[PDB]
Amino acid sequence: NNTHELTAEVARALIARGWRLTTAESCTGGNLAAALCAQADTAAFYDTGVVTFSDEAKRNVLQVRAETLAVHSAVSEACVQEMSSGILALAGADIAIAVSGYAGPEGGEDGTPAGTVWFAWNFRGQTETKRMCFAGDCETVVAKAVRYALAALSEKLAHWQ
Amino acid sequence: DEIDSDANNTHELTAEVARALIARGWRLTTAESCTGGNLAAALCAQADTAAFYDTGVVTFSDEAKRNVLQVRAETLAVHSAVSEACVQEMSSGILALAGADIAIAVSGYAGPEGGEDGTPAGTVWFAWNFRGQTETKRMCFAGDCETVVAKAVRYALAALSEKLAHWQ
Ligand SMILES: [Cl-]
Ligand SMILES: [Cl-]
Ligand SMILES: [Cl-]
Ligand SMILES: [Cl-]
Ligand SMILES: [Cl-]
Ligand SMILES: [Cl-]
Ligand SMILES: [Cl-]
Ligand SMILES: [Cl-]
Ligand SMILES: [Cl-]
Ligand SMILES: [Cl-]
Ligand code: NA
């Protein structure tokens, strides 16, 4: 239900399967990593997270393509797909989550509204994505995005194996 | 008790840090273990993050430190990850990766358990690396793991705020 409960449910499920997770964040700032590290048994399923807040960081740390960022922006399906692939490869994990969005109060230069967040969940190179538009102040958007990432991961585990 | 003080507030510190970095055209990067990304999260909650910060890592294990930050296996074997030598190497690795002016590394035992070498729970090492010039500090914070983490993040930032008032 709350962030701690969601994170505990993810941990138990991943540990039972012997799966490992990694994360790449932009707007959520390391709060997704923080939830996973606050969990009791972190090292049994997680050890690597990155925060890549700018286009240069995404290119440099995660090998996101310059052309992708210039054409689609950092807040895009293509960006989160590439972020997820980059972190999956760096960490040698089973599952990568990438999150990129506009926490607010400003939206994108291209008119993308504040609160728009893209997600990618990449299981061994098979990636699913979702765009959400969260209501609230910037800190509330971030908190909702972290919980969405975790809840959706919990839901997706079933169809993977 | 100016720098390690419950009378400090993390967002207030982050505001002061941002202004000082922006005024000098300096960029900050971070590498964390026990603090879990909460240091990055403070810096990213700050409103104009991109003007002074864009890269953080969380390297929760010895292997992640070797892989992501090129911490030497030998360093970890002799000194452990909760050590002066490790935070020095973490800070150098992230400074290089990010191309930043200043790197903070933090590595500790947040709790409830301590180190296998007997290091008490609550022991946290810090490194602040300004363009190569690295200073370190060992702290021992009281409280549960959530509390230790919050204190360590606040200390890292308060000490950075102080250092920014003197660096050149
Ligand atoms: Cl629970
Ligand atoms: Cl399971
Ligand atoms: Cl399995
Ligand atoms: Cl945490
Ligand atoms: Cl961002
Ligand atoms: Cl394209
Ligand atoms: Cl990569
Ligand atoms: Cl994989
Ligand atoms: Cl969608
Ligand atoms: Cl060596
Ligand atoms: Na200052």
Coordinates of C-alpha atoms and ligand atoms in Angstrom, one line a residue:
Chain A
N1 CA 0.0 0.0 0.0
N2 CA 2.5 2.8 1.2
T3 CA 6.0 3.0 -0.2
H4 CA 7.6 0.7 2.5
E5 CA 4.9 -2.0 1.9
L6 CA 5.3 -1.8 -1.9
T7 CA 9.0 -2.1 -1.6
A8 CA 8.8 -5.0 0.8
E9 CA 6.4 -6.8 -1.6
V10 CA 8.9 -6.2 -4.5
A11 CA 11.8 -7.5 -2.4
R12 CA 10.1 -10.7 -1.3
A13 CA 9.0 -11.4 -4.9
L14 CA 12.4 -10.8 -6.4
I15 CA 14.3 -12.6 -3.8
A16 CA 12.0 -15.7 -4.2
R17 CA 12.8 -15.8 -7.9
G18 CA 16.5 -14.9 -7.5
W19 CA 16.1 -11.8 -9.7
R20 CA 18.1 -8.6 -9.3
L21 CA 16.9 -5.1 -10.0
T22 CA 18.7 -1.9 -11.0
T23 CA 17.4 1.7 -11.5
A24 CA 18.0 4.8 -13.5
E25 CA 16.3 8.0 -12.4
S26 CA 16.1 11.6 -13.6
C27 CA 13.2 13.6 -12.0
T28 CA 12.7 11.3 -9.1
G29 CA 16.2 12.2 -8.0
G30 CA 17.3 8.9 -6.3
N31 CA 14.1 8.5 -4.3
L32 CA 13.4 5.2 -6.1
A33 CA 16.9 3.9 -5.1
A34 CA 16.3 5.2 -1.6
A35 CA 13.1 3.2 -1.2
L36 CA 15.0 0.0 -2.3
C37 CA 17.9 0.8 0.0
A38 CA 15.6 1.4 3.0
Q39 CA 14.3 -2.2 2.5
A40 CA 15.7 -4.7 5.0
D41 CA 17.2 -7.1 2.6
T42 CA 18.5 -4.7 -0.2
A43 CA 21.7 -6.6 -1.1
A44 CA 19.7 -9.8 -1.8
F45 CA 18.2 -8.1 -4.9
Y46 CA 19.7 -4.7 -5.6
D47 CA 23.0 -2.9 -5.5
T48 CA 23.2 -0.2 -8.3
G49 CA 21.3 2.9 -9.0
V50 CA 22.1 6.0 -11.0
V51 CA 20.6 9.5 -11.1
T52 CA 21.1 11.1 -14.5
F53 CA 19.4 14.5 -14.3
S54 CA 20.6 16.1 -17.6
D55 CA 21.0 15.2 -21.2
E56 CA 24.8 15.0 -20.8
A57 CA 24.5 12.6 -17.8
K58 CA 22.1 10.4 -19.8
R59 CA 24.5 10.2 -22.8
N60 CA 27.6 9.8 -20.6
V61 CA 26.5 7.4 -18.0
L62 CA 23.8 5.4 -19.9
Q63 CA 24.8 5.8 -23.6
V64 CA 21.4 7.4 -24.4
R65 CA 21.8 8.6 -28.0
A66 CA 22.3 12.3 -28.7
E67 CA 19.9 12.0 -31.6
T68 CA 17.2 10.5 -29.4
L69 CA 17.4 13.3 -26.9
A70 CA 17.4 16.0 -29.6
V71 CA 14.4 14.6 -31.5
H72 CA 12.3 13.2 -28.6
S73 CA 13.6 15.0 -25.5
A74 CA 14.6 13.4 -22.2
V75 CA 10.9 13.0 -21.3
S76 CA 10.0 10.5 -23.8
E77 CA 9.4 6.8 -24.4
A78 CA 12.6 6.5 -26.5
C79 CA 14.6 8.1 -23.7
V80 CA 13.4 5.8 -20.9
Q81 CA 13.8 2.7 -23.2
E82 CA 17.5 3.7 -23.8
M83 CA 18.0 4.6 -20.1
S84 CA 16.7 1.2 -19.1
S85 CA 18.9 -0.6 -21.6
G86 CA 22.0 1.3 -20.4
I87 CA 21.5 0.6 -16.7
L88 CA 20.6 -3.0 -17.3
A89 CA 23.9 -3.4 -19.1
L90 CA 25.9 -1.5 -16.5
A91 CA 24.5 -3.4 -13.5
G92 CA 24.1 -6.9 -15.0
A93 CA 20.7 -7.1 -13.5
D94 CA 17.6 -9.0 -14.6
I95 CA 15.2 -6.0 -14.3
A96 CA 15.9 -2.3 -15.0
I97 CA 13.5 0.5 -14.2
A98 CA 14.0 3.9 -15.8
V99 CA 12.0 7.0 -14.9
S100 CA 12.1 10.4 -16.6
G101 CA 9.6 13.3 -16.3
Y102 CA 8.7 16.8 -15.3
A103 CA 8.1 17.0 -11.6
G104 CA 7.2 20.6 -11.8
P105 CA 6.2 23.3 -11.3
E106 CA 7.3 23.9 -14.9
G107 CA 6.4 21.5 -17.8
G108 CA 8.5 21.0 -20.9
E109 CA 9.6 23.7 -23.4
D110 CA 7.6 21.6 -26.0
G111 CA 4.4 22.1 -23.9
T112 CA 4.5 18.7 -22.1
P113 CA 2.6 19.3 -18.9
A114 CA 4.1 19.4 -15.5
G115 CA 3.6 16.0 -13.8
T116 CA 4.3 14.0 -17.0
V117 CA 6.5 11.0 -16.2
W118 CA 7.7 8.2 -18.5
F119 CA 8.5 4.8 -17.1
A120 CA 10.3 1.8 -18.6
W121 CA 10.5 -1.7 -17.0
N122 CA 13.1 -3.8 -18.9
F123 CA 13.2 -7.5 -18.1
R124 CA 16.3 -9.1 -19.7
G125 CA 15.9 -6.8 -22.8
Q126 CA 12.0 -7.0 -23.1
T127 CA 10.8 -3.5 -22.2
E128 CA 7.4 -2.2 -21.4
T129 CA 6.6 1.5 -21.0
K130 CA 4.0 3.8 -19.6
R131 CA 3.3 7.6 -19.5
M132 CA 1.6 9.0 -16.4
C133 CA 0.4 12.5 -15.6
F134 CA 0.5 13.0 -11.8
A135 CA -1.4 15.7 -10.0
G136 CA 0.3 17.5 -7.1
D137 CA 3.3 19.6 -6.2
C138 CA 6.7 18.5 -7.3
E139 CA 7.6 16.5 -4.2
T140 CA 4.2 14.7 -4.4
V141 CA 4.7 14.0 -8.1
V142 CA 8.0 12.4 -7.3
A143 CA 6.5 10.3 -4.5
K144 CA 3.7 9.2 -6.7
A145 CA 6.1 8.3 -9.5
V146 CA 8.3 6.2 -7.1
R147 CA 5.2 4.3 -5.9
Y148 CA 3.9 3.8 -9.5
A149 CA 7.2 2.4 -10.6
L150 CA 7.1 -0.2 -7.7
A151 CA 3.4 -1.1 -7.9
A152 CA 3.7 -1.6 -11.7
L153 CA 6.8 -3.8 -11.2
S154 CA 4.9 -5.8 -8.6
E155 CA 2.0 -6.3 -11.2
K156 CA 4.4 -7.2 -14.0
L157 CA 6.3 -9.9 -12.2
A158 CA 3.5 -12.5 -12.9
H159 CA 3.8 -12.4 -16.8
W160 CA 7.6 -12.6 -16.6
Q161 CA 9.7 -15.7 -15.7
Chain B
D1 CA 27.2 21.5 16.6
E2 CA 26.9 24.0 13.8
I3 CA 27.5 21.4 11.1
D4 CA 26.2 18.3 12.8
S5 CA 23.0 19.7 14.2
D6 CA 19.3 18.9 14.2
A7 CA 18.8 22.7 14.0
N8 CA 19.8 22.4 10.3
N9 CA 17.2 21.6 7.7
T10 CA 18.1 19.7 4.5
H11 CA 16.1 21.8 2.0
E12 CA 17.4 25.0 3.5
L13 CA 20.9 23.6 3.2
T14 CA 20.3 22.5 -0.4
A15 CA 19.2 26.1 -1.2
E16 CA 22.4 27.6 0.2
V17 CA 24.5 25.0 -1.6
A18 CA 22.8 25.6 -4.9
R19 CA 23.3 29.4 -4.7
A20 CA 27.0 29.0 -3.9
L21 CA 27.6 26.5 -6.7
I22 CA 25.7 28.6 -9.2
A23 CA 27.6 31.7 -8.2
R24 CA 30.9 30.1 -8.9
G25 CA 29.9 28.1 -12.0
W26 CA 30.7 24.8 -10.2
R27 CA 29.1 21.5 -10.6
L28 CA 28.6 18.8 -7.9
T29 CA 28.3 15.0 -8.2
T30 CA 27.6 12.3 -5.5
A31 CA 28.4 8.7 -4.8
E32 CA 26.4 6.9 -2.0
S33 CA 26.1 3.6 -0.4
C34 CA 24.2 3.4 3.0
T35 CA 22.5 6.7 2.3
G36 CA 20.7 5.0 -0.6
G37 CA 20.2 8.0 -2.9
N38 CA 18.8 10.3 -0.3
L39 CA 21.7 12.7 -0.9
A40 CA 21.0 12.9 -4.6
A41 CA 17.3 13.2 -3.7
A42 CA 17.9 16.3 -1.6
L43 CA 19.9 17.9 -4.4
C44 CA 17.3 17.0 -7.0
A45 CA 14.4 18.3 -4.9
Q46 CA 16.2 21.7 -5.0
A47 CA 14.5 23.8 -7.8
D48 CA 17.3 24.6 -10.2
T49 CA 19.1 21.2 -10.0
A50 CA 20.4 21.2 -13.6
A51 CA 22.2 24.5 -13.0
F52 CA 24.6 22.7 -10.6
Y53 CA 24.1 18.9 -10.6
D54 CA 23.4 16.1 -12.9
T55 CA 25.0 12.8 -11.9
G56 CA 24.7 10.6 -8.8
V57 CA 25.3 7.0 -8.2
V58 CA 24.2 4.5 -5.5
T59 CA 26.7 1.6 -5.2
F60 CA 25.4 -0.4 -2.3
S61 CA 27.9 -3.4 -2.4
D62 CA 31.6 -3.8 -2.7
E63 CA 31.1 -5.2 -6.2
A64 CA 29.1 -2.1 -7.3
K65 CA 31.8 0.1 -6.0
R66 CA 34.4 -1.8 -8.1
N67 CA 32.2 -1.9 -11.2
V68 CA 30.8 1.7 -11.2
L69 CA 33.5 3.7 -9.5
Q70 CA 36.7 1.6 -10.1
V71 CA 37.3 1.3 -6.3
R72 CA 40.3 -1.1 -6.0
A73 CA 39.6 -4.7 -4.8
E74 CA 42.7 -4.4 -2.7
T75 CA 41.3 -1.2 -1.0
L76 CA 38.1 -3.0 -0.1
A77 CA 39.9 -6.1 1.1
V78 CA 42.3 -4.2 3.5
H79 CA 40.1 -1.3 4.6
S80 CA 36.5 -2.3 3.9
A81 CA 33.9 -0.2 2.2
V82 CA 33.4 1.9 5.4
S83 CA 36.8 3.5 5.5
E84 CA 38.7 6.6 4.6
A85 CA 40.4 4.9 1.6
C86 CA 37.1 3.7 0.1
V87 CA 35.4 7.1 0.3
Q88 CA 38.5 8.7 -1.2
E89 CA 38.4 6.3 -4.2
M90 CA 34.6 6.6 -4.5
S91 CA 34.9 10.4 -4.7
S92 CA 37.6 10.2 -7.3
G93 CA 35.7 7.7 -9.4
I94 CA 32.5 9.8 -9.4
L95 CA 34.4 13.1 -10.0
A96 CA 35.9 11.5 -13.1
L97 CA 32.7 9.9 -14.4
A98 CA 30.6 13.1 -13.9
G99 CA 33.4 15.6 -15.0
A100 CA 32.3 17.6 -12.0
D101 CA 34.2 20.2 -9.9
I102 CA 33.1 18.7 -6.5
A103 CA 32.3 15.1 -5.5
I104 CA 30.9 13.9 -2.2
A105 CA 31.2 10.2 -1.3
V106 CA 29.4 8.8 1.8
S107 CA 29.9 5.2 3.1
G108 CA 28.8 3.9 6.4
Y109 CA 26.8 1.4 8.6
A110 CA 23.4 3.0 9.0
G111 CA 22.2 0.0 11.1
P112 CA 20.9 -1.9 12.9
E113 CA 24.1 -4.0 12.4
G114 CA 27.7 -2.8 12.4
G115 CA 30.7 -4.1 10.5
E116 CA 32.2 -7.6 10.6
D117 CA 35.4 -5.8 11.8
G118 CA 33.5 -4.4 14.9
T119 CA 32.9 -0.9 13.5
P120 CA 29.8 0.4 15.4
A121 CA 26.4 0.9 13.7
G122 CA 26.1 4.6 13.0
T123 CA 29.7 5.0 11.8
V124 CA 29.8 7.0 8.5
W125 CA 32.8 8.1 6.4
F126 CA 32.6 11.2 4.2
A127 CA 34.8 12.6 1.4
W128 CA 34.5 16.0 -0.2
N129 CA 36.7 16.2 -3.3
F130 CA 37.2 19.6 -4.8
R131 CA 39.0 19.2 -8.2
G132 CA 41.3 16.5 -6.6
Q133 CA 41.7 18.2 -3.2
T134 CA 40.0 15.6 -0.9
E135 CA 39.2 15.9 2.8
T136 CA 37.6 13.2 4.8
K137 CA 35.7 12.8 8.1
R138 CA 34.4 9.9 10.2
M139 CA 31.2 10.5 12.1
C140 CA 29.2 8.3 14.5
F141 CA 25.5 9.2 14.4
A142 CA 22.9 8.0 16.9
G143 CA 19.5 6.5 16.0
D144 CA 17.9 3.9 13.9
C145 CA 18.9 3.5 10.3
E146 CA 16.4 6.0 8.9
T147 CA 17.7 8.5 11.4
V148 CA 21.4 7.8 10.7
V149 CA 20.7 8.2 7.0
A150 CA 18.9 11.6 7.4
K151 CA 21.7 12.9 9.7
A152 CA 24.4 11.8 7.3
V153 CA 22.7 13.5 4.4
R154 CA 22.3 16.7 6.4
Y155 CA 25.9 16.6 7.6
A156 CA 27.3 16.1 4.1
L157 CA 25.4 19.1 2.9
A158 CA 26.1 21.3 6.0
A159 CA 29.8 20.6 5.6
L160 CA 29.7 21.2 1.9
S161 CA 28.0 24.6 2.6
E162 CA 30.8 25.6 4.9
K163 CA 33.5 24.4 2.4
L164 CA 31.9 26.4 -0.4
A165 CA 32.4 29.6 1.6
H166 CA 36.2 29.1 1.5
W167 CA 37.2 27.1 -1.6
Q168 CA 39.1 28.5 -4.6
Ligands
CL1 CL 5.7 -5.1 4.7
CL2 CL 8.0 -14.4 -6.5
CL3 CL 13.0 -17.7 -11.1
CL4 CL 17.0 5.0 2.1
CL5 CL 15.6 15.8 -14.9
CL6 CL 13.5 8.9 -34.0
CL7 CL 25.7 0.8 -20.1
CL8 CL 19.4 -9.2 -18.2
CL9 CL 1.5 5.2 -22.1
CL10 CL 45.9 -2.6 -6.8
NA11 NA 28.4 28.3 1.6

